[PDB]
Amino acid sequence: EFITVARPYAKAAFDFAVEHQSVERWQDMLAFAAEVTKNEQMAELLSGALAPETLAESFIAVAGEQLDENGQNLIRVMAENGRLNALPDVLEQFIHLRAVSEATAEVDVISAAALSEQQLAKISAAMEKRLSRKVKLNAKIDKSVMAGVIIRAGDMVIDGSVRGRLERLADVL
Amino acid sequence: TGKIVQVIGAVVDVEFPQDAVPRVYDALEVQNGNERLVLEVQQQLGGGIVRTIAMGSSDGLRRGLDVKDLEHPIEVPVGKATLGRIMNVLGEPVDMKGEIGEEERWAIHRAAPSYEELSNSQELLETGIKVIDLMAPFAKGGKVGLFGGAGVGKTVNMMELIRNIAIEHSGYSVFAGVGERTREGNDFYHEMTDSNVIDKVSLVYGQMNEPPGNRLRVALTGLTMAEKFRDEGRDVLLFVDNIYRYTLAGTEVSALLGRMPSAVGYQPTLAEEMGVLQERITSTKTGSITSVQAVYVPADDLTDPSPATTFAHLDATVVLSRQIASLGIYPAVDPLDSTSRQLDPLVVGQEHYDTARGVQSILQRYQELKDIIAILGMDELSEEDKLVVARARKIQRFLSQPFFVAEVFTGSPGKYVSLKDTIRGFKGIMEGEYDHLPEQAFYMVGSIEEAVEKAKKL
Amino acid sequence: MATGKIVQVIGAVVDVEFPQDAVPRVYDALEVQNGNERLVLEVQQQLGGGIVRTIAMGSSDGLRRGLDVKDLEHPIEVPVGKATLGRIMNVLGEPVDMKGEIGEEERWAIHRAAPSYEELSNSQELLETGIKVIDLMAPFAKGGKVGLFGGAGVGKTVNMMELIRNIAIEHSGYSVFAGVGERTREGNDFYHEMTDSNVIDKVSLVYGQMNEPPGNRLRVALTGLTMAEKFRDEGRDVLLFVDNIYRYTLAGTEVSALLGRMPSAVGYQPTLAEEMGVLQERITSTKTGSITSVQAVYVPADDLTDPSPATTFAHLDATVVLSRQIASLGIYPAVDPLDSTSRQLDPLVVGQEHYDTARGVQSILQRYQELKDIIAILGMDELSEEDKLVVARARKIQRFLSQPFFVAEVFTGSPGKYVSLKDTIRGFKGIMEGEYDHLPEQAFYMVGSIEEAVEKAKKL
Amino acid sequence: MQLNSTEISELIKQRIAQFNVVSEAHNEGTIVSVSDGVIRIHGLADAMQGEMISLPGNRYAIALNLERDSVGAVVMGPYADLAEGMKVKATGRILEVPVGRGLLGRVVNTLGAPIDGKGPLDHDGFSAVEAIAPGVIERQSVDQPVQTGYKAVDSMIPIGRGQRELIIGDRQTGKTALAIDAIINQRDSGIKAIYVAIGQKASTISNVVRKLEEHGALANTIVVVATASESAALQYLAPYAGAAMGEYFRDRGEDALIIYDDLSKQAVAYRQISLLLRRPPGREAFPGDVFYLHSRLLERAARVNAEYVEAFTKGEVKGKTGSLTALPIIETQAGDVSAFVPTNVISITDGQIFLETNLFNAGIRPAVNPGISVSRVGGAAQTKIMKKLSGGIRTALAQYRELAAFSQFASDLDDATRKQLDHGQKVTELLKQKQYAPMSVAQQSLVLFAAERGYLADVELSKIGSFEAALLAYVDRDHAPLMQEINQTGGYNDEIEGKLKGILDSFKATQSW
Amino acid sequence: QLNSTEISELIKQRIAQFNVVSEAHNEGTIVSVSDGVIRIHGLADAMQGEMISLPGNRYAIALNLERDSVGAVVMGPYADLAEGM
Amino acid sequence: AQAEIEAERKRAREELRKQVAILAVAGAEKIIERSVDEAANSDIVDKLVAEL
Amino acid sequence: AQAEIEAERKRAREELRKQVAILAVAGAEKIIERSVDEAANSDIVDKLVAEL
Ligand SMILES: Nc1ncnc2c1ncn2[C@@H]1O[C@H](COP(=O)(O)OP(=O)(O)OP(=O)(O)O)[C@@H](O)[C@H]1O
Ligand SMILES: Nc1ncnc2c1ncn2[C@@H]1O[C@H](COP(=O)(O)OP(=O)(O)OP(=O)(O)O)[C@@H](O)[C@H]1O
Ligand SMILES: Nc1ncnc2c1ncn2[C@@H]1O[C@H](COP(=O)(O)OP(=O)(O)O)[C@@H](O)[C@H]1O
Ligand SMILES: [Mg+2]
Ligand SMILES: [Mg+2]
Ligand SMILES: [Mg+2]
């Protein structure tokens, strides 16, 4: 998958967007550059053997919204190295960099029920204490949770569920 | 549900929705023109791509064909319903008779029996062949391997073993043809039907014409049938036509599976792929499998990784030599390389053990003298060295024997020799009881009485 | 502050990303906490932007992606000088003898350039070893380099122990012992041997054992060279003993594949000659001081064709080749006279007496090596009587080159012998002429002087 | 019997009482591919190299490649049930095995789960599978014997307690027989035994365990198994589990003998793992660090001084030196020692025993080649009687073989050469010995005294074997107090030589072969 | 899929002004140092066998002219060279 | 001995049918952390006898 | 033979432990899911957010 080759471009784009105070515009621009990449006919063209600059100018032709001489030049750079299919992964790493820079974390909470919303106030305060970031909750109700709740933040998980506790005790053979 | 996305030789990549990706060794199915093709899943790549091997000809496959996900591995009929019938790798009937009256189907991928279940046995099993049960005797429920290059008599020796054992033995038998000549399968089928012994034998044939996936999986099909008969509590005979073709079919696909080459270009998984197959051929406290396997030796190189790996898995090993075969001594067994777990004074008893080690010592000394003889000639030897040579040559001739399946080749009637006659004869030769007979008296005679009768007419 | 982060761990090789304006220099040391234990990394390569590829001076186990790495702006520096005497140190110059802190006054980088062309010296003063075959066939000189070549189990270690016993005790000066890739048991036994004989006060020991990761073995030899160079630059005369030069090259081979280099020859790294030369060109005697060095060289499967021994042959001055063909007969020291040689063996040093004796012995053994093939098939009765006499006297000379050694007392159950150069020359002259035509072959085997071979003959 | 099952039912009830309800926190990833026992995992930012990674079920993987954006790991068990998108939790744990005295007489797998079916283990806790060996200052010189019971090995190639001795040769030359006889002979020496089986077929293991059970050896032995069916990650780790079990005894003042069977198959499994992880191949397609693998395995076998034992035991055991002795086995293809794995293992060990096919076919069994076989530790490993007698044997025999080659067409044989050749043939005949028939110190010493004082010299060659048998029987019935003296002391003096001389004179006069 | 001199600050430079050809062809910067070989970004007018001058009055020989960089071999001690020179 | 232990085996199964209910309730109460006087013991006994 | 029977004894015991434990937790899953209560669920949350 494109993650490893997408990282350098994501960093460069975020750094440039920080200098010119345009991060939000850059995000909305990369969204469009990634979305044109997903189109059928454009995807067939990307898999073809066009010389870099001809492909770059056709892509820039479709990507009209892009800020000329900044985003369109980013397309030219990626077209020199044929990374245009990595654009969905050049995006979302830009979003990751933004969330890190803005010291903000999406954190997820899965339970057997819709949580009491007072519970969510306590959970959000607790997460803003566990991690020194503002925490956006987007909790979920899940049938698999017999009872209790799972808290997931980044790649750390704190299992408070009855299902997990059962399959943790059932392990004690 | 699935879509074909690549076709490279025998390997087909299929994409599935990420919530539905098939398990490893699941069977998939795709319509190829006017026929149905099964694919077996080998690897899960990322993003719902899955990499599979075609159980059939992959020519004519397009990209973008819709693929059906069968929820189970390859499963084959087992039990008495298979007896007397010829079946394919997929467990399909290949003889022109009707459908197989199966009652049960077993997945061909299985685990070996646990260490607790294994059973020991020391019951010596007799054969009609002098050299085999003299030099490398083997027991009921053990494994025998015939090692040899191209055209040195692996199949003929295995057919003699079939004739003798699998007809004095009373239980069921399974014959697995793996990547060998179709002509030989048809010949075997008929001479089984003419003898009316076919109704005791299940035959699975994966011969060389088949594309690589069939040759890869057919051995597991045969083992699955043999395991059904073993777990029923019977005593079973399993014959494998050439085990080497299984490893070779692994080699052919390994590069297309994206695995770095090893050693002499073999797949890196060679030892594991051979071991998981071989460990399932085992006698158990519930029932016993006796196994005879042919093992082709590429370029006669016994140090090649495939024969070298095979050697550790067998109880008795008989090594056939092209250099002996070109003398016309048949069976072309090398007694200085053939060996058995059963050549042990406790099981065989002292007379047999002493006779075998005496023969081995004399033949080794003859090897030591041949380099002197090549340059100087024999006249320079000492008078005891000349006696060593004179006896070693007679021993080499007396290991020859006419076979019934070799009646068509030689034109002379086949011979069956009891073990006692072998021990008595070789002990007499080494003691010099027959120092007055010519060498020709010993060539292709069944027993020592026949050597003296041949000597009277030279 | 720590300014870099681990981004890969594959085997012994760790990649670290620094800010693009503070990238560590090549061969700089780096520091990281591997849990409780502090770990050092040595920078091999600068690649991409800000990323550096490094070798771990310790086990990679327990390292994580993300750990903070401190940048130490110097290469690995080791204690040097008199403080090192009587101490055992690891590759990093840390005490491993439990005796406490080294208490140094100075520390030197292990990476340094060789002496310049103007600084070299040619003072080939002859040095006596007390060993027949070495003193005759391959005479040493002070300040030269000596290599003991051989495959496994041929006598390199006990030969080096005999040389240590003879010269190193008599040297009256400091000595450095570099246990490159050595068996731990043998390092322990050597340490107690030096302690019980009470000479440990004049020797400093640097040990990188077999069990240690490739970086430790790769750099322990340079640590030993740095200590020897400190004593040389003071103006002292020092002895440097290297347990096995081959294992340095082998550690290089281990890391080379992971450092992304394509392979060459028989699996060896492409840089083999460069690495060998860069190590070997520092072991030289300058106008200020002399380093005398004895190096053991492993020869894989006794194949002297193999690139590592074939390459090291060019750097030495005396080369002693130990052969398993001789060792199979049990006739130790097992030195092959037809393969061993020295720069010092010419009349302008050795004198005509010694030169003529050595060339005579070589010619006799060569002729006998030809006659032996005839004998093996046609029989000795088929030879000329002159050739029969040559075969006899050569087969005697072959056994007279054997000598019981002090250090091998346990193996031979017999006392070891020392011989002077003058007596050695006289003995080989005596066999080349008729004086001992009448003694059997076994009367020479592991005897000592010619003056006691007659005694063994009387006993035989 | 089963009323005690009600009692252990109460034990199950009390599991609930002991259990802990606290919610832990852990780091998480997802499997992104599965192939041939290797898995790639996305995530696991806090995974460490060599860490145990826990999978669905009760299955584990070892993290080996910590690349950017992915972890590569090998599954320690049947992998085929794993699937893409399965969640996976990183523990904090390194791999550990059960260890202790209770293991003796048990057959366990490389994870230490018993497979003999004799119920659960009894053990003294757990020890790390990967561990560093004692340093230079912590060792003691090897100066005690471990008796093989074979005339050839114990005379020519002595093994000391703490030595690493390579057994090397081609297939079907007696490599395993020597090692299991070495185990069998320890039944009463006080040395614990460990047999590690890498890549063997399970019925062969069952047969070897059966032979250990027919003799008295099984009660003193741990059997560690990784059969040819088991994964290449369960292989390649088995030697280290066996080494941990040996180290438990080594670090408490006890002696252990560990037999790694087919170190070469460990190398082959490691090559499989390395190639499936796409690591660059080196010479002969092995990875470069295979030497580091075997060297760090074999440098654990050591003799440690009493101070290290006291520090480890915290003063519970004082004044006792512990030792671990390793006997690795290597298979050569055609006597070719130049292969990569044999060259590495020959570099590492303290010696080797060469077994070869020509001697074995000639009937010289055990087929020990006296010339290319060596023991670096030397007579320091022997008892004084064996040291004194055996010193001459091996070098005399090697020069005998050279002399025979040179003699093969000489007709006139000088008396010195005739003496050497006759003596060499009789010594070559003397060292042959039957399987599972180990000889005590006194028996070997007596037979060597018969050889080195020329009592054999007149005896005709085929009768030498019956001579040896009759001499042992005679001495066992008539002179047993001296046998006890020699076996207990191992001493040697002028009165010992005189008593042996009297015994040889008396036997050779009075008795018949 | 792998990187070929795709490093963050060079990419940012091109994003700001793609036509970096405006800078002189005569000069470049080291971007890698290993085993006596250096990779140089720039030197659009480099030619096969040309001498490239390094700091310290040292030289390297341009041996690989690649589509994005020059591979050159250092004619002397190299261990002190650093990327960005 | 095999016949002997088989007889004791069926006896022990009869005994353990009761004890396994104590496992059910103790495990439920420990897992649910607090205690709970649940009513529908029909489910308890249904499992209790049915699978045993 | 006698030591063999005393090994077989332990082999018999362990299997019964395994059976009873697995089937008991199988019953406990039914019992606990049927005995879920909203106050107890809230108390699980109130426990874990108090220690988190
Ligand atoms: N016992 C025998 N007596 C006479 N001829 C024999 C005997 N065994 C083999 N041969 C000869 O060798 C030929 C080849 O035999 P066979 O087919 O058994 O060889 P194979 O080693 O199994 O060969 P392949 O590898 O090609 O399958 C026979 O057709 C026959 O000519
Ligand atoms: N001292 C001995 N005397 C006689 N026979 C022996 C002796 N030692 C071993 N053998 C026999 O040699 C054969 C091979 O022995 P063993 O299994 O020990 O060999 P190996 O080299 O370990 O074999 P493999 O490569 O199959 O593992 C067996 O039949 C065994 O009985
Ligand atoms: N001069 C000697 N006297 C007696 N034995 C020797 C002599 N030289 C070598 N040996 C024998 O060779 C063995 C190994 O030699 P060593 O030098 O330790 O091997 P390596 O060269 O591999 O380091 C010794 O243990 C001893 O048995
Ligand atoms: Mg055939
Ligand atoms: Mg040495
Ligand atoms: Mg074996």
PDB file of C-alpha atoms in Angstrom, chain A residues 36 42 45-46 50 52-63 75:
ATOM      1  CA  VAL A  36     -10.427  12.754  -9.327  1.00  0.00           C
ATOM      2  CA  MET A  42      -8.792   8.865 -15.072  1.00  0.00           C
ATOM      3  CA  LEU A  45      -5.136   6.952 -17.788  1.00  0.00           C
ATOM      4  CA  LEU A  46      -3.035   6.780 -14.594  1.00  0.00           C
ATOM      5  CA  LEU A  50       2.008   8.543 -20.629  1.00  0.00           C
ATOM      6  CA  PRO A  52       5.049  12.437 -16.850  1.00  0.00           C
ATOM      7  CA  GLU A  53       4.393  15.991 -18.069  1.00  0.00           C
ATOM      8  CA  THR A  54       1.572  15.040 -20.459  1.00  0.00           C
ATOM      9  CA  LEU A  55      -0.163  13.103 -17.666  1.00  0.00           C
ATOM     10  CA  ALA A  56       0.436  16.009 -15.281  1.00  0.00           C
ATOM     11  CA  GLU A  57      -1.141  18.556 -17.612  1.00  0.00           C
ATOM     12  CA  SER A  58      -4.156  16.339 -18.323  1.00  0.00           C
ATOM     13  CA  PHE A  59      -4.655  15.770 -14.584  1.00  0.00           C
ATOM     14  CA  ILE A  60      -4.259  19.501 -13.876  1.00  0.00           C
ATOM     15  CA  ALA A  61      -6.800  20.098 -16.650  1.00  0.00           C
ATOM     16  CA  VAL A  62      -9.315  17.979 -14.757  1.00  0.00           C
ATOM     17  CA  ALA A  63      -8.193  19.470 -11.405  1.00  0.00           C
ATOM     18  CA  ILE A  75       0.670  17.427  -8.987  1.00  0.00           C
TER      19      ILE A  75
END
